[PDB]
């Protein structure tokens, strides 16, 4: 995957978990021969789609990272709704894989357990990056070449 151009956009709300998710992505990136991907930070998950759109004009793959944790109001339902609609629309507009690595949990423990910390069960940041790079390679093979 030494030829693919990777971009990473991650939200800052719940900073510790974000650092873990971002850490997993960079490791997979380096393993596959990409030492310096484009990394961009935003304040909230709702702001992810609009920044991915801009990143898509100059990259072969985009990875979105973040954490949304449920509260006491139905607001949780509407934050995740926007993210779903936004990223799906961007991918098909630009014909570019926009990998989904945004956690959506019921509690804080659940999110911590899926971020890739020392004693976590899983690492969504790594899974997402492997998904982006592989889909980019496939599209390269399918499309016009010589």
């Amino acid at each position: 995957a030494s030829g693919v151009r990777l971009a990473i956009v991650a939200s800052s709300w719940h900073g510790k978990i974000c650092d873990a998710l971002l850490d997993g992505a960079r490791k997979v990136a380096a393993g596959c021969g990409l030492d310096d991907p484009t990394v961009v930070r935003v304040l909230g998950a709702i702001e992810i789609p609009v920044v991915a759109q801009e990143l898509a004009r100059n990259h072969d793959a985009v990875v979105a990272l973040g954490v949304v944790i449920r509260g006491q109001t139905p607001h949780f339902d509407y934050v995740c709704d926007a993210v779903t609609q936004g990223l799906t629309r961007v991918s098909l507009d630009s014909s570019t894989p926009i990998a989904n690595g945004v956690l959506t949990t019921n509690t804080e423990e659940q999110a911590l357990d899926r971020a890739g910390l020392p004693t976590s069960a899983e690492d969504k940041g790594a899974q997402a990056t492997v998904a982006a790079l592989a889909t980019a390679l496939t599209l390269r093979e399918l499309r016009a070449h010589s």
Copy 2:
């Protein structure tokens, strides 16, 4: 800092007291960041927000939407919020402009008051939303074509 960004704010009037609080938080954050006079527009209901944000988006770098939707005894609550989500998301991607979401969606009136930024409130959504808009505008300015 953000002295060069062009900000617009659209807020609904249904439940007027809370609207004033939300609007008050936004303006303070705006003044703190060096923007003394943003474009402010009022509407009658939440459903009317998206169509006014679309117009504001052709002359501004960031738009902030403010309002409160409180649940009743019918499934009507669910359909008001559905429209707002679909509308704002579509506007942002059509115009490539951050449309910050500061519309409260609560079970009770107490919950809404506690998230508006009154003297004894736990948080202030109007302030968070404005900080979200201004920062995303600055990022897009850096990523985009410059000299």
Copy 3:
């Protein structure tokens, strides 16, 4: 609001309540100096969006009126889904306020109490028309003149 061009589309399903909703709209219209708005009737709520699209090509505001009452099947949930998606799409395509005055209730008493009959608690038909007319005047001021 004597310069605004208003149009009203109302469904016939549950005829009595429709008449009330339509009655409230016309009164507010006359009060604001508009003596004869464009009035169009349809058979069902699903048919509203496609008629509002046509009305939007020569009016500054459109008001949609109707009643959907829940039954014994999940059908209720899908009629309201279509109406929400349709009206939202029309408003943004045409840059025109499409006021929502479609009742969505659990019982028949609930709908009667929100229609503007002699002993009703509120009148959605009047609220919706006030919403349309005001939004049209705002857009008029924001836009290009003179």
Copy 4:
């Protein structure tokens, strides 16, 4: 009169008996209104309806969609109806054509049978849908450009 309207009908085959009832109601209303031979097309599933309605919309004044979706033991039921709702609504607005919705969505098989228009049924969705299509087509005819 409706004798000038060009009608098209697309119906799925999943649960064949009920489909025949739904289709039978539509044709009767069609003949009553002076249209003896509408365009009838069959598909295998409800998900396949939207893409066939799009094609039919390029040379008809009205399209009627007929079918039955019955709930199972998984959340799958929720996702089949979601697609149908999204698809049909998008098609009607793209083509400015009434796409009448006559797709049943029930909890049990009894419920579906009771709404199809069989000898002892409480109502007939196939008939209601066709009356909805033909009337909306006539209205659009009157509103639009004529001489």
Copy 5:
């Protein structure tokens, strides 16, 4: 006789064993109908399916999407399936091409195994989906411009 149709198949690999079953059913139906060598492409996850089907639709008369999504302990399950629904429906209408839906969405792993077409399964969604795509392609060919 579907010997003239150009078929493409895109399948996710998450839960590999079930994927192989789903893929196995599709290819058998394919061979039965006289198509010995369809285009087969693998992806890592279900969210990646829509974007690959869009590319495949530029060169084929039908696309079949295959995969399994199993519910967990968080509301995440709800948002994975929402994306797939919106994506596939959009692609089909953009390209005027049948994109058959063969993506399982279950509560437990037993339920998924039971619907994949293994020795002792109750049904095979991979086979049903391919039959749906090839039939819809033939119908569209008949409706459209021919000599």
